[PDB]
């Protein structure tokens, strides 16, 4: 017997390979990403993490993109520009998935997009998972 797991742990598309879709994290108090590949890669592909906030004309539409700030850990290096990023290694196999999440919330919406759109950035798929609804 399986369950309707989507009731408790819904997931939403964040990057389908041609467009980036803002995702709402307001009602969920935890979340994370998930990465997968569909073809052999030619080089590393980095990503940028953004966050949005309520637009002026309507409280249910996101505003312009705001780049996320970095948060150094207990003790360790910090990014050269103070902004969070994710780098997908070239060695990643087609039959594997990668998981990682940011430590801080910031605005009630989140987004992600590649640093440069090209034939290599279309070979990745990013999905966001939630947990712990608060309403």
């Amino acid at each position: 017997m399986n369950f309707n797991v989507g009731v408790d742990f819904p997931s939403f598309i964040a990057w389908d390979g041609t467009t980036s879709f803002p995702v709402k994290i307001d009602g969920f108090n935890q979340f994370g990403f998930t990465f997968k590949v569909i073809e052999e890669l030619t080089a590393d592909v980095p990503f940028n993490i953004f966050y949005h906030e309520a637009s002026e004309a309507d409280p249910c539409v996101p505003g312009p993109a705001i780049r996320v700030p970095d948060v150094p850990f207990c003790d360790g290096v910090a990014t050269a520009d103070g902004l969070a990023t994710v780098v997908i290694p070239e060695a990643v196999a087609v039959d594997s998935f990668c998981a990682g999440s940011v430590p801080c919330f910031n605005g009630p919406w989140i987004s992600i997009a590649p640093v440069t759109v090209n034939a290599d950035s279309a070979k990745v798929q990013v999905t966001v998972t939630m947990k712990g609804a608060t309403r």
Binding site: V77, V87, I88, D95, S96, F97, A99, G100, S101
Partner: peptide, 27 residues
């Protein structure tokens, strides 16, 4: 700089031949 947690989904079988000494020769 986020650090990813990776692991594969599929298991690939392995077929390794075992080889044994091929009899003696005068050398």
């Amino acid at each position: 700089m986020i650090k990813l947690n990776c692991r594969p989904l599929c298991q690939t079988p392995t077929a390794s031949r075992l080889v044994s000494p091929p009899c003696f020769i005068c050398r």
